Amino acid sequence: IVEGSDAEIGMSPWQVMLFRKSPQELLCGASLISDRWVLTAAHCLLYPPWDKNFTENDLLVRIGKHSRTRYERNIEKISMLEKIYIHPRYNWRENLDRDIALMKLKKPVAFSDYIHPVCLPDRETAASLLQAGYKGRVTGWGNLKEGQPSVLQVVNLPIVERPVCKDSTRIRITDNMFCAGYKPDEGKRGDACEGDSGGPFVMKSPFNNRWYQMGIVSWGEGCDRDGKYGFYTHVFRLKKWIQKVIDQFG
């Protein structure tokens, strides 16, 4: 996260860390949506251009963390993966369209003050909150500049009008993504960066006070560059797929 700040303890209990076994290193962010499921970006697991193709036995999921590098004994919980499901139409060849993947944990994780799932939006919630100008929140242990934070970072960013998103890049934007960030003349800055991928973009409903995950950190061109914006996978647009996988495989 660029131009963010340290998160408070328990501020994002759904935040998950994708950890590579060997060499031990941070791969991406992810989110907890149930006691058995984790949501992340498909490019975190599969991306042929960089010969990236991780399997279930290659990674570990670390939940309830605050510190990036320390093993937070008695606080964080580490879990193994039973299966990984990538959207069948994930477009890694062109624009990362449908950049989404689900991961089923081998065993349910017990909730605590530091581990709690985030809600998935319903049509009505998505409709009223996903509007240009409205701010969401991004969290992650990614780089602080385009080095590495000591603890989880957080930043609040406004959703940007689709035309502006389109006119800021050469990449073909689809209905399955939205972009966010400040405009060059708004004064404030902030953006996700390397290491933050797969992380959650959340918003708090003023109707029922619950937090909803509206997006997944997907891609960008550089980090916190003026005139550029971060792009996120539109979670609701792909909920039909999410629901299918969940009730069909457990």
Partner: peptide, 11 residues
Amino acid sequence: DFEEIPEEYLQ
């Protein structure tokens, strides 16, 4: 610079 996680998880 990651701290050694328990082998019980790396097994």
